Design an enzyme around this catalytic site. Structure first.
Site, PDB file in Angstrom:
ATOM      1  N   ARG B 288       0.800  -1.219   0.000  1.00 25.58           N
ATOM      2  CA  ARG B 288       0.000   0.000   0.000  1.00 25.58           C
ATOM      3  C   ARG B 288       0.833   1.269   0.000  1.00 25.58           C
ATOM      4  O   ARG B 288       0.431   2.275   0.601  1.00 25.58           O
ATOM      5  CB  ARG B 288      -0.968  -0.008   1.177  1.00 25.58           C
ATOM      6  CG  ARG B 288      -2.029  -1.074   1.029  1.00 25.58           C
ATOM      7  CD  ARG B 288      -2.738  -1.000  -0.323  1.00 25.58           C
ATOM      8  NE  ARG B 288      -3.579  -2.169  -0.573  1.00 25.58           N
ATOM      9  CZ  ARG B 288      -4.404  -2.295  -1.608  1.00 25.58           C
ATOM     10  NH1 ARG B 288      -4.514  -1.321  -2.498  1.00 25.58           N
ATOM     11  NH2 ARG B 288      -5.122  -3.397  -1.756  1.00 25.58           N
TER      12      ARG B 288
HETATM   13  N1  LIG Z   1     -10.907   0.261   3.041  1.00 20.47           N
HETATM   14  C1  LIG Z   1      -9.957  -0.581   2.579  1.00 20.47           C
HETATM   15  N2  LIG Z   1      -9.940  -0.982   1.292  1.00 20.47           N
HETATM   16  C2  LIG Z   1      -9.001  -1.816   0.828  1.00 20.47           C
HETATM   17  N3  LIG Z   1      -8.016  -2.319   1.596  1.00 20.47           N
HETATM   18  C3  LIG Z   1      -7.921  -1.996   2.905  1.00 20.47           C
HETATM   19  C4  LIG Z   1      -8.909  -1.088   3.481  1.00 20.47           C
HETATM   20  N4  LIG Z   1      -8.588  -0.936   4.776  1.00 20.47           N
HETATM   21  C5  LIG Z   1      -7.483  -1.687   5.010  1.00 20.47           C
HETATM   22  N5  LIG Z   1      -7.088  -2.310   3.890  1.00 20.47           N
HETATM   23  C6  LIG Z   1      -5.926  -3.211   3.779  1.00 20.47           C
HETATM   24  O1  LIG Z   1      -5.531  -3.581   5.091  1.00 20.47           O
HETATM   25  C7  LIG Z   1      -4.128  -3.438   5.247  1.00 20.47           C
HETATM   26  C8  LIG Z   1      -3.854  -2.877   6.627  1.00 20.47           C
HETATM   27  O2  LIG Z   1      -2.565  -2.292   6.700  1.00 20.47           O
HETATM   28  P1  LIG Z   1      -2.317  -1.375   7.982  1.00 20.47           P
HETATM   29  O3  LIG Z   1      -3.669  -0.780   8.280  1.00 20.47           O
HETATM   30  O4  LIG Z   1      -1.128  -0.485   7.729  1.00 20.47           O
HETATM   31  O5  LIG Z   1      -1.915  -2.440   9.111  1.00 20.47           O
HETATM   32  P2  LIG Z   1      -2.770  -2.546  10.461  1.00 20.47           P
HETATM   33  O6  LIG Z   1      -4.086  -3.099   9.980  1.00 20.47           O
HETATM   34  O7  LIG Z   1      -1.980  -3.457  11.357  1.00 20.47           O
HETATM   35  O8  LIG Z   1      -2.804  -1.127  10.950  1.00 20.47           O
HETATM   36  C9  LIG Z   1      -3.651  -2.514   4.149  1.00 20.47           C
HETATM   37  O9  LIG Z   1      -2.513  -3.110   3.532  1.00 20.47           O
HETATM   38  C10 LIG Z   1      -4.775  -2.463   3.149  1.00 20.47           C
HETATM   39  O10 LIG Z   1      -4.368  -3.169   1.980  1.00 20.47           O
END
Ligand SMILES: Nc1ncnc2c1ncn2[C@@H]1O[C@H](COP(=O)(O)OP(=O)(O)O)[C@@H](O)[C@H]1O
Ligand SMILES: Nc1ncnc2c1ncn2[C@@H]1O[C@H](COP(=O)(O)OP(=O)(O)OP(=O)(O)O)[C@@H](O)[C@H]1O
Ligand SMILES: [Mg+2]
Ligand SMILES: [Mg+2]
Lengths: 50, 421, 542, 71, 105
Positions: B288
């Site tokens: 991401r």
């Molecule tokens: N609304 C969304 N749409 C698509 N993918 C999402 C969405 N929310 C989270 N993700 C996915 O979930 C992953 C969470 O990464 P991150 O939030 O940095 O780690 P954590 O969940 O431990 O905080 C991201 O890589 C993203 O690809």
């Protein structure tokens, strides 16, 4: 009736075979977490008395 | 025995005297080409750069394999973790990046060149010697720097060696260059910290690791980033490698570093042992940061690839086996079975960004559907060879496929020597 | 001045000991070391006998010698707080890192206060809309409620808390205080970019009009800072609660690293460890952090905490004592996110205090308890559907099973900050949009619409139009044929003159890394120190 | 509240005030038993009182057992 | 196991012949380290093994390599403990084994 079941119980044996596949690994990763959490009680039980 | 303090914080020699040399985790090189000549010694334990000293990630970093540059994009300064089981292609992808960084260094100017750092933690000395031999015969020896703390050496050498590789790549982060560091098998570096902390009688936590095994992987990985242009604009791209155990993501080290890095690259063993090498599991593996900072134009054509490989895996493996067949979605499956084998590649041969875009063009727009699925991997290498080499020179140059070029490209892709058909 | 001027007794990593001559200072007071390369601060916590105290170092401890002069402020760790901090980034001690000079400190309050009592407590429940259908139905957030987002390292507790800020922190009347505690340092930077270009961080002369105060103890620091940063950003709330009286917004990120930073140092303090490896004091220390986040009767705190469960194992004690410290639990699971349903909020455990039929009314309670009924019907029948297929039950529940896959796809929702890596823009959904939209799906008002029609939609307007798009696309399989002839003379020069219209970068050999280089004298034998301390080689004995 | 007493040890208080609060909670209600009346007692979150017991002993150099709870 | 290595290291490094070797029951040698390194008062690791697993199991493996003077190959008989390939003793064992030959009834 007996023919489609002969291929419906085939795929049911595969599907209830793969749920055995993950679950033994869910048995193992909880068991090694069990002995270790049971082991560190002994070290925390022994280090206080030495 | 007589101890002697040195007066300097723990250090490792850095600089161009290390280029093409295999070093230990402290600084004594074991290649046999004598001690280091053009080097300076900085701290191995450096505070990671702050927020205001950093900026966003803008310039893409290519990797050279079709599986990774298509769906899991990587930018300069972004740390993308490779994860998987043993003998499943984690180390193969990482050295394919290093070979790919070599030839692209022969097509970029000096201020945009890259310099590789491949640490080695807990691998056999037999196989890591085959890694530096392979890095010589591919010519990536000129821009690689090796740290090989094998399984023989003691526990603080396998604890310090990824810190030494990051200090060796700290240099290019400081004076304006660009870096690519590969942390190899960082799960074995966790057990190295487990050894050095349990024998100090420190009380361990979940799965008997000590408490600070997160901050160890934190400070190791937070030192690789993208800086602002005030401090030379340098960058550092990390590639940690975590060995998982039989389809587990809930190992304590595996879930630790994933909450540090910007994304994972899942390598599922189910995709591997049918022959699909590399086995990049395209639906579990995201990244991401590189989505905006990818090579554009590829984002125009692989977005269709991402949406079909969103939906190709959904109907897989029980189109005929599980319940029944409908034949309304044979269009996605018999196009997706082409695109999965399109992401295959034979080993130790990277495909650049200009030769992947036309490769990912040819299977997407419908040009290769008529060739059956048993010979598409000869069709794609034919497409690289059949289409005249003007189009590869243009698409790298402008960086984005214009409507004035694809209409020329659509005519060229039809007059190819198809296999079979 | 040898009264009240001690030296370092001993250093164990991030934990140091100071032996004092004159008088040992009170607990939770600061120290200032002398002679280090960084202004390193210590905080006394235990008086370990021997006229010697117990500290946790807030910065890098590399280079402490056992004679260095250590002076105290005679006071707890005070942070420059105030409206002038709105638009600054502070670390644990509150020195600025945003390079905008110092901070115009309105006051300097200590980070260690008593929690507010019962007499100052408020029971005034109201709702908070967010623009999320899973939040505003299954566990609505209280306006003055503590909010928990348990995530399992990659299920979206950073994105959903960044989506939430980009919805409600602009429209809310009060400021925000973001306390990044142990988040990756790059993701603090993209919050620094996004708040300037959306007009929340205003630099130059317009600092006092801004709406955000940043506090950052990201995971680059040794665990003194991460043990205390979540306390410091809470004291930016205390000046905005007791003094200012405004409604502050405290989006504390990754508060588990607070519990882990104490877990790093309490293994060194000689303490017998608790269950699975945490300290004994996580009951009081999480109490000593959470219960300053309380809405007083003279101002509230509208705060969101984020508790990172360690290994997707919610029976770990670090979230298990954290459930009770939270009004609105919103658990994010791992397995549901593997299908791509974003956000992957567990519908059958995310419970709030606002989910109550006498505060939000029984119009909404009947909607959520129907959804939680048929999912519990569906989760009860996961065991049969995997091993025998769907084709064995009656038509009284196989209607409900497809009804479950409808409401499972409809909980998916794009996010207005996720538009950078998803392409589609997020949707801002009102409260009346959802409950109207969720009433008919319970009865079956849209059962003839397919199950993929509910994926990634915002409102009940978008449920039929995508179902019209799926149907329209099938007839676009054989709708028309495209051909582009008579273009080769219009705007294209050639294919071969395409080669000659590119400016060529002159790639220069001899990269020459000796520029900006020092290359000091490095010989064979390592430099040692003799007894007088002169740099001599090692004498040849092994 | 006319016929309700409530002893309320918060989580932001120390351990032994939580350790004693069910003990002091039954000290009120023994008076209602001693003088003939009937008494209701609810020892709410009694596991969290036992965690309040586990905090004091493990600082007190006392041997731990099952789940690091004392003997 | 070190004795079998060094009578192999005389034939590998002086005579120059390609020697065979059988470090029999490498689970037992790992467990023989698990009882000798728990006896010396070291703090126990994961599931019950020594904390010097990867370093001291590798110390047997890393002296079985090839060189210009010769080559020693080992045939390590492996017993999988409790039929789990995620147990920590075969986990580090299969990070050095290059060929894996199964024998079935
Ligand atoms: N609304 C969304 N749409 C698509 N993918 C999402 C969405 N929310 C989270 N993700 C996915 O979930 C992953 C969470 O990464 P991150 O939030 O940095 O780690 P954590 O969940 O431990 O905080 C991201 O890589 C993203 O690809
Ligand atoms: N593209 C490919 N073509 C053919 N074979 C491949 C390809 N990629 C990987 N392999 C095979 O998979 C293996 C990958 O080796 P690699 O070192 O990456 O595995 P690993 O999991 O990293 O093991 P270790 O961690 O022990 O190094 C190689 O032995 C190679 O034979
Ligand atoms: Mg490997
Ligand atoms: Mg996270």
């Amino acid at each position: 009736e007996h023919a489609s079941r002969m291929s419906a119980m085939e795929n049911s044996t595969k599907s209830a075979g793969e749920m055995l596949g993950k679950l033994t690994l869910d048995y193992n990763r909880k068991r090694q977490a069990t002995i270790t959490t049971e082991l560190i009680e002994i070290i925390a039980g022994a280090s206080a008395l030495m | 025995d007589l101890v002697y303090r040195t007066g300097q914080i723990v250090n490792v020699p850095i600089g161009p005297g290390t280029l093409g040399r295999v070093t230990d985790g402290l600084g004594q090189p074991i290649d046999g080409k004598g001690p280091l000549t053009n080097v300076r010694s900085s701290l191995v334990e450096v505070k990671a750069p702050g927020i205001i000293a950093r900026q966003s990630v803008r310039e893409p970093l290519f990797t050279g394999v079709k599986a990774v540059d298509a769906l899991v994009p990587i930018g300069r300064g972004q740390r993308e973790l490779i994860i998987g089981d043993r003998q499943t292609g984690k180390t193969a992808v990482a050295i394919d990046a290093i070979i790919h960084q070599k030839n692209c260094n022969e097509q970029v100017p000096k201020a945009q060149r890259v310099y590789c750092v491949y640490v080695a933690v807990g691998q056999k000395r037999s196989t890591v010697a085959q890694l530096v031999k392979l890095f010589t015969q591919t010519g990536a020896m000129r821009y690689t720097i090796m740290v090989s703390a094998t399984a023989s050496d003691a526990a603080p050498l396998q604890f310090l060696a990824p810190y030494s590789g990051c200090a060796m790549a700290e240099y290019f982060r400081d004076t304006g260059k660009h870096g690519l560091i590969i942390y190899d098998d960082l799960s074995k570096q966790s057990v190295a910290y487990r050894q050095m902390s349990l024998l100090l009688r420190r009380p361990p936590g979940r799965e008997a690791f000590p408490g600070d095994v997160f901050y160890l992987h934190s400070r190791l990985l937070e030192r690789a980033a993208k800086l602002s242009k005030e401090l030379g604009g340098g960058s550092l791209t990390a590639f940690p490698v975590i060995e998982t155990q039989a389809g587990d993501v809930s190992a304590y080290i595996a879930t630790n570093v994933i909450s540090i890095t910007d994304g994972q690259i899942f390598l599922e063993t189910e995709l591997f042992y049918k022959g699909i090498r590399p086995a990049l599991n395209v639906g579990l593996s995201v990244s991401r940061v590189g989505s905006a900072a990818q090579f554009p134009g590829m984002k125009q054509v692989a977005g269709t690839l991402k949406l079909e490989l969103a939906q190709y895996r959904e109907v897989a493996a029980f189109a005929q086996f599980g319940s029944d067949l409908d034949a309304a979605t044979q269009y996605v499956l018999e196009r997706g079975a082409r695109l999965t084998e399109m992401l295959k590649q034979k080993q130790f041969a990277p495909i650049p960004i200009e030769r992947q875009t036309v490769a990912v063009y040819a299977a997407t727009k419908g040009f290769l559907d008529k060739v059956r699925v048993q010979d598409i991997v000869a069709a794609e290498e034919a497409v690289i060879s059949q289409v005249n080499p003007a189009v590869f020179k243009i698409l790298k140059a402008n960086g984005k496929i214009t409507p004035a070029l694809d209409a020329h490209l659509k005519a060229e892709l039809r007059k190819v020597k198809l296999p079979g058909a | 001045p040898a009264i009240d001027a001690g030296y370092v007794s001993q250093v164990i990593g991030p934990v140091v000991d100071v032996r004092f001559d004159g008088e040992l200072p009170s607990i939770l007071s600061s120290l200032e070391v002398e002679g280090h390369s960084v202004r390193l601060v210590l905080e006394v916590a235990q008086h370990m006998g021997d006229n010697t105290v117990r500290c946790i170092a807030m910065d890098s401890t590399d280079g402490l010698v056992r004679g260095q002069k250590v002076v105290d402020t005679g006071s707890p760790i005070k942070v420059p707080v105030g409206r002038g901090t709105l638009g600054r980034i502070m670390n644990v001690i509150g020195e600025p890192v945003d390079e905008q000079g110092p901070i115009d400190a309105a006051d300097i309050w200590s980070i260690h206060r008593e929690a507010p009592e019962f007499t100052e407590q408020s029971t005034e429940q109201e709702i908070l809309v967010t623009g999320i259908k899973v939040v505003d139905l299954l566990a609505p957030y209280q306006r003055g409620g503590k909010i928990g987002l348990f995530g399992g390292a990659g299920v979206g507790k950073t994105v959903l808390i960044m989506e939430l800020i980009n919805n409600v922190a602009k429209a809310h009347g009060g400021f925000s205080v973001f306390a990044g505690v142990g988040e990756r340092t790059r993701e603090g930077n993209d919050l620094y970019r996004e708040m300037i270009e959306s007009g929340v961080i205003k630099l130059g002369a317009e600092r006092g009009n801004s709406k955000c105060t940043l506090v950052y103890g990201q995971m680059n620091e040794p665990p003194g800072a991460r043990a205390r940063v979540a306390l410091t950003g809470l004291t930016v709330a205390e000046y905005f609660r007791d003094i200012e009286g405004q409604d502050v917004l405290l989006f504390v990120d990754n508060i588990f690293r607070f519990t882990q930073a104490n877990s790093e140092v309490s293994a060194l303090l000689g303490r017998i460890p608790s269950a699975v490896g945490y300290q004994p004091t996580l009951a009081t220390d999480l109490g000593g952090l959470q219960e300053r986040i309380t809405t007083t009767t003279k101002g509230s705190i509208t705060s969101v905490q984020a508790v990172y469960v360690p290994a997707d194992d919610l029976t770990d004690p670090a979230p298990a004592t954290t459930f009770a410290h939270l009004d609105a639990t919103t658990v994010l699971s791992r397995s549901i996110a593997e299908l791509g349903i974003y956000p992957a909020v567990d519908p059958l455990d995310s419970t709030s205090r606002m989910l109550n039929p006498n505060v939000i009314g029984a119009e909404h309670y009947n909607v959520a308890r129907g959804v939680q009924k048929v999912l519990q019907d569906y989760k009860n029948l996961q065991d049969i559907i995997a091993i025998l297929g769907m084709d064995e039950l009656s038509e009284e529940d196989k209607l409900t099973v497809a009804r479950a896959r409808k409401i499972q796809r409809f909980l998916s929702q794009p996010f207005q900050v996720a538009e950078v890596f998803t392409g589609t823009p997020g949707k801002y959904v009102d409260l009346a949009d959802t409950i109207s939209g969720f009433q008919g799906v319970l009865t079956g008002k849209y059962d003839d619409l397919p199950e993929m029609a509910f994926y990634m939609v915002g409102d009940i307007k978008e449920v039929k139009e995508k179902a019209d798009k799926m149907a329209k696309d099938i007839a676009s399989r054989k709708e028309a044929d495209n051909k582009k002839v008579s273009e080769e003379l219009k705007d294209i020069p050639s294919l071969d003159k395409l080669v000659s219209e590119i400016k060529e970068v002159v790639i220069e050999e001899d990269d020459g890394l000796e520029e900006d280089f020092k290359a000091e004298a490095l010989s064979s034998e390592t430099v040692v120190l003799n007894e007088e301390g002169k740099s001599v080689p090692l004498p040849k004995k092994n």
